[PDB]
Amino acid sequence: HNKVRTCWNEGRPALAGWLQLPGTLHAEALARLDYDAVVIDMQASPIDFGQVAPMLIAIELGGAEPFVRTQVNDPSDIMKLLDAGAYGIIAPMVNTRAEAQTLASALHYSPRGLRSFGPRRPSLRYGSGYLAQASETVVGLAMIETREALANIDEILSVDGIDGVFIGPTDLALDLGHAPLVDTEEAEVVSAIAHVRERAHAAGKRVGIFCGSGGFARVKLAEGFDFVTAAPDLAMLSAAARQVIADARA
Amino acid sequence: HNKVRTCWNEGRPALAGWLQLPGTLHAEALARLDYDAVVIDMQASPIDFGQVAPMLIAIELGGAEPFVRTQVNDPSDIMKLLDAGAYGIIAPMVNTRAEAQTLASALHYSPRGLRSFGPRRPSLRYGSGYLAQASETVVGLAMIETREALANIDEILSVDGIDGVFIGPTDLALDLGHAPLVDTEEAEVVSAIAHVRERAHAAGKRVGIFCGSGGFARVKLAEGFDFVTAAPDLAMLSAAARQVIADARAL
Amino acid sequence: HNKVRTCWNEGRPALAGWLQLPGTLHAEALARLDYDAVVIDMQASPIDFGQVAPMLIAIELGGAEPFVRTQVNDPSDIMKLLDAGAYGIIAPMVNTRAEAQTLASALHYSPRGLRSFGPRRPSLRYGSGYLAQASETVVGLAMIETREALANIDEILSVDGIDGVFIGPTDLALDLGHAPLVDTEEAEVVSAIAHVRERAHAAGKRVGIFCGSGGFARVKLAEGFDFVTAAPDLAMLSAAARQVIADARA
Amino acid sequence: HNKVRTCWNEGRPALAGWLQLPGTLHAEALARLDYDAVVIDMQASPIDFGQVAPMLIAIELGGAEPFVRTQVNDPSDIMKLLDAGAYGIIAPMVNTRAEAQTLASALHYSPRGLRSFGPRRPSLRYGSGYLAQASETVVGLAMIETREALANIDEILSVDGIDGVFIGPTDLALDLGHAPLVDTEEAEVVSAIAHVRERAHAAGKRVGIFCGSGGFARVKLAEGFDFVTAAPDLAMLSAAARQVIADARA
Amino acid sequence: HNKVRTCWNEGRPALAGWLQLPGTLHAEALARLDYDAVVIDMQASPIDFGQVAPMLIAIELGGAEPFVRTQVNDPSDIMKLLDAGAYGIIAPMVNTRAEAQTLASALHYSPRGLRSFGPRRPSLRYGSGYLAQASETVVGLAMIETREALANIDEILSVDGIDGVFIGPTDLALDLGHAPLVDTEEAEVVSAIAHVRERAHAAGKRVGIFCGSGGFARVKLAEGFDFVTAAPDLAMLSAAARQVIADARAL
Amino acid sequence: HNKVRTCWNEGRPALAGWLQLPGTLHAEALARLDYDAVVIDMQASPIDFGQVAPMLIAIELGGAEPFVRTQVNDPSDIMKLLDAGAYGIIAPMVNTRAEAQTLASALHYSPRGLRSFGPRRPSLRYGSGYLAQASETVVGLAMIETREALANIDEILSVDGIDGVFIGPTDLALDLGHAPLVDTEEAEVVSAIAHVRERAHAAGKRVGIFCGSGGFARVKLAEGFDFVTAAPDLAMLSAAARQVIADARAL
Ligand SMILES: [Br-]
Ligand SMILES: [Br-]
Ligand SMILES: [Br-]
Ligand SMILES: [Br-]
Ligand SMILES: [Br-]
Ligand SMILES: [Br-]
Ligand SMILES: [K+]
Ligand SMILES: [K+]
Ligand SMILES: [K+]
Ligand SMILES: [K+]
Ligand SMILES: [K+]
Ligand SMILES: [K+]
Ligand SMILES: [Mg+2]
Ligand SMILES: [Mg+2]
Ligand SMILES: [Mg+2]
Ligand SMILES: [Mg+2]
Ligand SMILES: [Mg+2]
Ligand SMILES: [Mg+2]
Numbered sequence A, C, D: 001h002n003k004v005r006t007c008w009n010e011g012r013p014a015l016a017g018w019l020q021l022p023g024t025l026h027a028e029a030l031a032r033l034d035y036d037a038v039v040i041d042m043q044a045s046p047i048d049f050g051q052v053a054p055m056l057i058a059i060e061l062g063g064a065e066p067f068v069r070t071q072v073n074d075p076s077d078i079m080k081l082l083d084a085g086a087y088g089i090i091a092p093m094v095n096t097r098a099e100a101q102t103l104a105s106a107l108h109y110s111p112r113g114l115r116s117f118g119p120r121r122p123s124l125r126y127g128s129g130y131l132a133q134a135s136e137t138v139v140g141l142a143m144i145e146t147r148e149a150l151a152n153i154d155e156i157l158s159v160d161g162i163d164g165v166f167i168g169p170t171d172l173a174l175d176l177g178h179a180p181l182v183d184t185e186e187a188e189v190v191s192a193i194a195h196v197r198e199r200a201h202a203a204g205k206r207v208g209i210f211c212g213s214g215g216f217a218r219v220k221l222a223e224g225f226d227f228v229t230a231a232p233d234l235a236m237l238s239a240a241a242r243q244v245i246a247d248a249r250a
Numbered sequence B, E, F: 001h002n003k004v005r006t007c008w009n010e011g012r013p014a015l016a017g018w019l020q021l022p023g024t025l026h027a028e029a030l031a032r033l034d035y036d037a038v039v040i041d042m043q044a045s046p047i048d049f050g051q052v053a054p055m056l057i058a059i060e061l062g063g064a065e066p067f068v069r070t071q072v073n074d075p076s077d078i079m080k081l082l083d084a085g086a087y088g089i090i091a092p093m094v095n096t097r098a099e100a101q102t103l104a105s106a107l108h109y110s111p112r113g114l115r116s117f118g119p120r121r122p123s124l125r126y127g128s129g130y131l132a133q134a135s136e137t138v139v140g141l142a143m144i145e146t147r148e149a150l151a152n153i154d155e156i157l158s159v160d161g162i163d164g165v166f167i168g169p170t171d172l173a174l175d176l177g178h179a180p181l182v183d184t185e186e187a188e189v190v191s192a193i194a195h196v197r198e199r200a201h202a203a204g205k206r207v208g209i210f211c212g213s214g215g216f217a218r219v220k221l222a223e224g225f226d227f228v229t230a231a232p233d234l235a236m237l238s239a240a241a242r243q244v245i246a247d248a249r250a251l
Helices: A003-009 A025-031 A051-060 A075-083 A096-106 A120-127 A129-137 A147-151 A153-158 A169-175 A187-201 A214-223 A233-249 B005-009 B025-032 B049-061 B077-083 B099-108 B120-126 B131-137 B149-150 B153-158 B169-175 B187-204 B216-220 B235-248 C003-009 C023-033 C049-062 C075-084 C098-106 C122-126 C132-135 C147-151 C153-157 C171-174 C187-202 C213-224 C233-250 D003-009 D025-031 D049-062 D074-085 D098-109 D120-124 D131-135 D147-151 D153-158 D169-175 D187-202 D214-223 D235-249 E002-010 E025-032 E049-062 E075-083 E098-108 E120-126 E129-138 E147-151 E153-158 E168-173 E187-202 E214-222 E232-249 F003-009 F025-031 F049-062 F075-083 F097-107 F118-127 F131-137 F147-151 F154-160 F169-175 F185-202 F214-222 F233-248
Strands: A014-019 A036-039 A067-070 A088-091 A140-143 A164-169 A206-211 A227-232 B014-019 B039-040 B065-071 B088-091 B139-144 B163-169 B206-210 B227-232 C015-020 C037-041 C067-069 C088-091 C139-144 C166-169 C206-210 C225-234 D016-019 D036-041 D064-070 D089-093 D140-143 D166-169 D208-210 D228-230 E014-019 E038-042 E067-068 E087-091 E139-144 E164-167 E208-212 E227-232 F014-019 F037-041 F065-069 F088-091 F139-144 F166-167 F204-211 F227-232
Touching: A003 A014, A003 A067, A003 B139, A014 A025, A014 A067, A014 B235, A025 A036, A025 A051, A025 E120, A036 A051, A051 A067, A051 A075, A051 B163, A051 E049, A051 F233, A067 A140, A067 C147, A075 A088, A075 A096, A088 A096, A096 A140, A096 A153, A096 D025, A096 F233, A120 A129, A120 E025, A129 C225, A129 E025, A140 A147, A140 B131, A140 E038, A140 E049, A147 A169, A147 A187, A153 A164, A153 A187, A153 B120, A164 A187, A164 D016, A169 A187, A169 D147, A187 A206, A214 A227, A214 B235, A214 F088, A227 B235, A227 C166, A227 F003, A233 B187, A233 B216, A233 B227, A233 B235, A233 D235, B005 B065, B014 B025, B014 B065, B014 B235, B014 E067, B025 B039, B025 B049, B025 C132, B025 D214, B039 B049, B039 B088, B039 C003, B039 F204, B049 B065, B049 B120, B065 B139, B077 B088, B077 B099, B077 C098, B077 F166, B088 B099, B099 B139, B099 B153, B120 B131, B120 D025, B139 B149, B139 F154, B149 B153, B149 B187, B149 E098, B153 B187, B169 B187, B169 B206, B187 B206, B187 E187, B187 E214, B216 D064, B235 C075, B235 E168, C003 C015, C003 C132, C015 C067, C015 C233, C015 E232, C015 F214, C023 C037, C023 C049, C023 E232, C023 F118, C037 C088, C049 C067, C049 C075, C049 F049, C049 F131, C067 C139, C075 C088, C075 D140, C088 C098, C098 C153, C122 C132, C122 E038, C122 F025, C139 C147, C139 C153, C147 C153, C147 C171, C147 C187, C153 C166, C153 F075, C166 C187, C171 C187, C171 C206, C171 E153, C187 C206, C213 C225, C213 E232, C225 E232, C233 E014, C233 E025, C233 E214, C233 E227, C233 E232, D003 E049, D016 D025, D016 D064, D016 F233, D025 D036, D025 D049, D025 F233, D036 D049, D036 D089, D049 D064, D049 D074, D049 D235, D064 D140, D074 D166, D074 F147, D098 D140, D120 D131, D131 D140, D140 D147, D140 D153, D140 E129, D147 D153, D147 D187, D147 D208, D153 D187, D166 D187, D169 D187, D169 D208, D187 D208, D214 D228, D214 F233, D228 D235, D228 F233, D235 F014, D235 F025, D235 F088, D235 F169, D235 F214, D235 F233, E002 E014, E002 E067, E002 F118, E014 E067, E014 E187, E014 E232, E014 F049, E025 E049, E025 F003, E038 E049, E038 E087, E049 E120, E075 E087, E075 E098, E075 E120, E087 E098, E098 E139, E098 E153, E098 F185, E120 E129, E153 E164, E153 E187, E153 F075, E164 E187, E187 E208, E214 E227, E227 E232, F003 F014, F003 F065, F014 F025, F014 F065, F025 F037, F025 F049, F037 F049, F037 F088, F049 F118, F065 F139, F075 F088, F075 F097, F075 F118, F088 F097, F097 F139, F097 F154, F118 F131, F139 F147, F139 F154, F147 F154, F154 F166, F166 F185, F185 F204, F227 F233
Parallel strands: A014 A036, A014 A227, A036 A067, A067 A088, A088 A140, A140 A164, A164 A206, A206 A227, B014 B039, B014 B227, B039 B065, B065 B088, B088 B139, B139 B163, B163 B206, B206 B227, C015 C037, C015 C225, C037 C067, C067 C088, C088 C139, C139 C166, C166 C206, C206 C225, D016 D036, D016 D228, D036 D064, D064 D089, D089 D140, D140 D166, D166 D208, D208 D228, E014 E038, E014 E227, E038 E067, E067 E087, E087 E139, E139 E164, E164 E208, E208 E227, F014 F037, F014 F227, F037 F065, F065 F088, F088 F139, F139 F166, F166 F204, F204 F227
Antiparallel strands: none
């Protein structure tokens, strides 16, 4: 079973890791922590497909559901990843109902979508009965990180075949005319985010958000978020080394 | 100029990072911090030659001195790394004078060593007049992490063409019959490390040490070690994540 | 000369291999067998471009025409591959005349198409006279694997600059509302396939099909197919190991 | 600062290298020569993203501004590269004002464009003030290599958010119905190129051109070109080895 | 637990696959079959360290024990593989007791061997209390494929810290002056293999063998070999394809 | 047939290219020129096993004989390259007869050597009846680039199973106390090279040499060297670019 979906079915949210660094060793290492999922970021990173492919295997062995935030909302790229044992897709810059249908169409075999049939790695996981349950095995979120996304939120949330939406808070803050700051106090950004969540849950759909600290993720979890990511590997690693250095040199 | 040798020339220590994770992005980032050097571990890691080459380029662009802890003390492996712009070499399990001579032979052109001439990247960095300073551009440390190497410390320090030694405290604890624990303070191991430190300085040679934490590294800097590494990327990242998860899930 | 095109000119079909596993050693090994071509599958596989590039070289040394089934019908991806010594392109999910023109446009230098000029590997094969013969050196098939493709078959086959079409029988079976089974007996799927072939040959164009067994490929060859692939490396390798195990344990 | 932009601000053109061969050693080596920039060609080459990523680092260490000629004018591919320390983008086959706006939109953060915010490598170069100066740090050229591009030159040059255009002379010669020859004497091709340059400078925008010899680049430099590339690594390497062989065998 | 050592503990053989082809997709797939272990050949293959690391992860996710046949019997190569989650080691051309001691030294922490401590992947799999069972988590086999190794079988079996040996029948045939043919039954070679088998069991040590076919492997299981590999991916794939082509082109 | 051995059989020299740059595109292109062979330098370069494998395939498709200058003279490294379709081996720093014997052992199947049997690519190229000609399909050269190797030239040439030697003039100049300069004509080094050439031919053995330029290579062909390499890709590319830049920026 999909571990995030089994979180949701058992009435609780998922906490996910977020990797910008390529490779299998930190991926597995983080996956064995009390993360329900680890997201590989193929957008704001040097991670291409050759590197993602072994990292999905690493996360699954680690005991976390492999998730990928794609470079772009592209049906054929999303389908390749599904076939490689990506079991969650987060599509950036989903701004319209049409783009969200485009996302949906990639996540589901006909007749519900137009997903190409060749399930190399999921067939090994789920076996010859994969077709029947393929849809439930995969989690699909549209990212909301523009003013336009915000305006089209109900129409995006109308789209059958996506589990929910995922807030890109830095892109969202920037396009709102504010500082691209993670975990921001900026009142407009904060109200926009709360508005996205309320609309999502009213549409009976799931909402997630990207966090830069445990402190902030704790708060989002308390406010009812279903899928919270904290924190990117490079940011935690950078912060950790800065502390090691200041402690060593004090 | 070698950033580590500059520290040493002004009679100050060098502080170095330590990578077990392949990739250029974290190698550049940590290199931009207040690290004098960044060591790529090619031993206890999934980093092979193909991954190491571009990480060297990134650490150098970062503005730290590129260091490698080799898989093994093998002269052909060491030479190929130096030609790929390793300016720092930490050769593991150097247990005998013969083995220090073998390290030494790789770090120096004839007649001082038998290093092969083909310095693809060094000649790009130091241009004309690289050869004239080749030996000083490179830093070479013999790793002490065995009973045998503890016994043979004086003969290892006698070898002209090495700068000094580098302690592996966990592997030394293990080989002295004790728990292989991070930043060990097992009394006997503490004694053996103190002895190595003193014999390095008595010999006019630099002494360095592997640290798993900022606390231990600060104490080693205070004990006058010349080269302190702190801490491995993977151990810093796992602890960082464990803490972010505990704060996220806290009542 | 293109070995598949020289098959066709000499009044006989091509039998091609089908690789989902990355690497050069099996590629060369299979290429030296009595395969006229080996197809690299960049869709239902972890094969990205970094891995495809050496595999094209391996197949050509092996003595088989390097063919690639792309992730997607994309002009710029197809052009890169041509430039890397892909000499056959099979484009998945070609559903409309417009998408088939899009395919055609990538395969041909102006004025016949809008192929970007920079023929890194074909220049080495064919020399400074490559331009004059570039078109004949490359084989272009549109895949037919949807109901929509089926409906638009004559219009697809109308498009100047494609050699023919290639049936995706599992995607085709699935979208027809049937089991995604290779080498299927399902009567609708079988009639649809026979209909695609008849229309193709009536349009004086070539038709191929993907097979999962030698038994089935034999039949398609007999029915007049011009380009038959059997069988994917992973499927033959999986089947072979299952036999080795049952023989060893009997 | 961007070294090409500082060339232009100081009233002089840029001479750039052009790499079709993957890897870091020749990249750094060429970057330390009296090249102001080195362009990595991801179109007419086997260079994918995994190989480009370390080559950008190599060029920057070498002391030349890392430039990339993309496979295709794609917003999400261009954005990934920016984030990887590509500081110049040359987009091939820019044929219309709309495609040039598409290019522009990728190069600039909102509100001037819709660039996704996650500046992994430029943040390390420029620091926390990167946002304010992001636009100036990057150089954007639209390639003109079709008749259609030629026809739409004023409209392309109208687009705010591109520095200028870059002539693809072989594709341009080919589509003009002439031989795809580098550094061509063909009178129509020569007049078209001179016309592109004149229109560019009249629009107060920058113009570049791809060259195959130092002799030709010298001439383009004299005619007022702002960004001249000479010559592709494989072509110089091939020519050099042919000379070595003829000298050795004489 | 080591799936091979579990087979052995219940006094049953282990059956293992054999990969010469790089990639994670076929390594996972074959690992999901009724193979106890899957050996990655890093000797007679284009598989280097960079490709081997993710194949280990895939075989383990597949649910077979990850095994490696090394390029050479070299302790630093063996240690780096064990730390990357090789739980099974087959070291080629082990011809002398000294060479078995050298294999042995890599497979065990001090004081039983001189394995370096840095178990990145093993500590993730076996968590707390890995060190307490480290030796049993790993399986190490000395390869017998020479005249010299045939002569020295008893002294190789005497070495405490190896589980047993692994026969290379083709390389042994070749070195005994005979055609290097797959699953050879050359009378003299058959005698030499039988002798190795008997001296392994007399010594209380496990004995294994390379098979190129399911037929030969079944006979070896019947002769009581403890570890049988069958058959190499590339040889299984070429024969599979040859047969599909012959059926496709048949009248 | 081996293109180098064919040259030799008709008593003509072989001319070879030399790659320090990873990638298949330039390896194919230069192989299509009038080069008899193309040597991949795995020593003074960032080329590891993973990059070397597909470059061999490209040089062979190019229509030149695939050659490798190894990182080190190590039999397991040499064997794995031959099985990956290296048909030409240049082993560096071969200084003693023992070291030539060690090269020799890797190039030949028993009983003439102890090469492991697993010829994945060679058996694809030469099909049935590869084994019958395996030794002649491969060319092996001992590199002379030291004082020691100059002294021991006669005992190195005595070793049956090597074709001859390959001079590294820069490394030989360096080790003889002189400037390590490209295509050196330092009088003493010229003497040492002439002596090596004469002792190779006296011994009935082939002699080859590293050239950094077409001029030097032409002179060596004229002095009757049997194998001349000219010139490294990276040195040819940097000079080519320097010249294109100087012409571009000229008044
Ligand atoms: Br945790
Ligand atoms: Br963050
Ligand atoms: Br066949
Ligand atoms: Br199939
Ligand atoms: Br210059
Ligand atoms: Br050109
Ligand atoms: K977990
Ligand atoms: K620094
Ligand atoms: K064939
Ligand atoms: K420069
Ligand atoms: K299994
Ligand atoms: K040739
Ligand atoms: Mg965003
Ligand atoms: Mg040398
Ligand atoms: Mg399909
Ligand atoms: Mg063009
Ligand atoms: Mg150690
Ligand atoms: Mg063997």
